[PDB]
């Protein structure tokens, strides 16, 4: 589980671009304030390898 991939982002990337921001994703109108919850998911998921 040391390999991670980003799942949520507001806008697509330009060619050859790198994003390492770990702020809590906002999916609704209410702010997340750095706390997970409804419409508040961690942008990057994990990779299951078995």
């Amino acid at each position: 589980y040391n390999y991670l991939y980003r799942l949520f982002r507001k806008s697509n990337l330009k060619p050859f671009e790198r994003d390492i921001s770990t702020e809590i994703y906002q999916a609704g109108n209410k702010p997340c304030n750095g706390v997970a919850g409804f419409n508040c998911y961690f942008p990057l998921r994990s990779y299951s390898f078995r």
Partner: nanobody
Amino acid sequence: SAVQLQASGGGFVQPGGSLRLSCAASGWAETFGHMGWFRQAPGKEREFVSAIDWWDTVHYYADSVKGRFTISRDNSKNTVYLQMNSLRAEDTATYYCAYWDMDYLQNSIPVDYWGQGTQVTVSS
């Protein structure tokens, strides 16, 4: 799969006391994935605490907590409960509600989602 986990309970208690924790799961998943609780201390790694299935058939507790922690599943509101009794100082840490999406839990290694940290402090 899209599972949202909510954790309830926690706070400050005294050694030897009793407490109740709970986790609720919402959304959709691959199957009736099991539900468990982990515990992480400041400066240390996460530790397996408890694991139960979606129909209250398999109970799994860590060796260091065998016969002391209890986990149960409700019948009508989908919320899993973790009954805690006779706490000591080593139980002061942050608990997390862990979900794994498969029918049979060979090991606790495959984790797909986590839960909000619930602080449980045991002190005089």
